[PDB]
């Protein structure tokens, strides 16, 4: 009875061996700056739970980005703030420059370093094979750092990866779904975009870890090197697993669910089917062949595995032959 437990292969006890104030974000006391330092220039995004603007810091004439926070639970304000403060200064981690609030409504706003992003739907089609390897290495620096600091991102995808291509400058943004990793903790599986959801989320395995970000990164890489957006095109959460099984095959899916004694939701019974494991070379075509190499396919093969434990860590990924041509 019950699923087999799992823990991260790396950085397992980072939070266990840190003081309570490091990870107990509900007790965090926010330090608030002066809202009047910042004036709004233009809207960048409007979700149900945030409004984001380009803004000017009128004290130093630098652009910043203002993220108005309106989450369903106020706990989540302190989670995003505490995680951003814990990770501040990490390689390729967006910098939280300030935290301000409306003196009247008390609506809080995060103030970030500005990145001169180009929408991925315009930028990615211009990147070369070296640019993808270079940007992927920058994201891996950010993920090995955040994992090393006890934090899972849980929302790795193009919309949360800012790139100022002119300055070869990448920042991993959007730490609002990020969580502190505690070995044995059962997490909400209702996290991440459907196309980037890992198999553990789809089969309701709650004892996941940093390895979830590595699957999300694999999905992002596959979409870039194959020019197939998204790579795993599910119509719903149940279909999403079927799209993954059409590539990775159903045999290895059953080895995964049996290793962890996972019970497959009955909704899978009639849509899963039976699928061979495909060769990654089947996804090469004239439009993408200039981005694909044996090293890229081997690297993708080692990220996109059902078993979260078997996936490369960020640091293992950084030592892969795909990044041999990338500085450090």
């Amino acid at each position: 009875s019950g699923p087999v437990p799992s823990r991260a292969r790396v950085y397992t006890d980072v939070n266990t061996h840190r003081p309570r104030e490091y990870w107990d974000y509900e007790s965090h006391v926010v330090e608030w700056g002066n809202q009047d330092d910042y004036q709004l220039v233009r809207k960048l995004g409007r979700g149900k739970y945030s409004e984001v603007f380009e803004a000017i810091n009128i004290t130093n004439n630098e652009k910043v980005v203002v993220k108005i926070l309106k989450p369903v639970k106020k706990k989540k304000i302190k989670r995003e703030i505490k995680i951003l403060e814990n990770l501040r200064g990490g390689p390729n981690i967006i910098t939280l420059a300030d935290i301000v609030k409306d003196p009247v409504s008390r609506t809080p706003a995060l103030v970030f370093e500005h990145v001169n992003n180009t929408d991925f739907k315009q930028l990615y089609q211009t990147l070369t094979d070296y640019d993808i390897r270079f940007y992927m290495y920058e994201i891996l620096k950010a993920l090995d750092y955040c994992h090393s600091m006890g934090i899972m991102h849980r929302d790795v995808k193009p919309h949360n990866v800012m790139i100022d291509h002119e300055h070869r400058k990448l920042r991993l943004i959007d730490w609002g779904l990020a969580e502190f990793y505690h070995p044995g903790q059962e997490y909400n599986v209702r996290v991440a975009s459907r196309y980037f959801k890992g198999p553990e989320l789809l089969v309701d395995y709650q004892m996941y870890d940093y390895s979830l970000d590595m699957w999300s990164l694999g999905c992002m890489l596959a979409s870039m090197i194959f020019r197939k957006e998204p790579f795993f095109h599910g119509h719903d959460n149940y279909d999403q697993l079927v799209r993954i099984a059409k590539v990775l095959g159903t045999e290895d899916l059953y080895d995964y669910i049996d290793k962890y004694n996972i019970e497959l939701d009955p909704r899978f019974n009639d849509i899963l089917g039976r699928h061979s494991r495909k060769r990654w070379e089947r996804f090469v075509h004239s439009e993408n062949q200039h981005l694909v190499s044996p090293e890229a396919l081997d690297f993708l093969d080692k990220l996109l595995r059902y078993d979260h434990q078997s996936r490369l860590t960020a640091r293992e990924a950084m030592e892969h032959p795909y990044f041999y041509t990338v500085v450090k």
């Binding site: 809202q35 004036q39 603007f53 203002v66 108005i68 609030k101 409306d102 009247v104 409504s105 609506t107």
Partner: peptide, 7 residues
């Protein structure tokens, strides 16, 4: 403006 900010 918006949430106490000026444009």
């Amino acid at each position: 403006a918006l949430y106490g900010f000026k444009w």
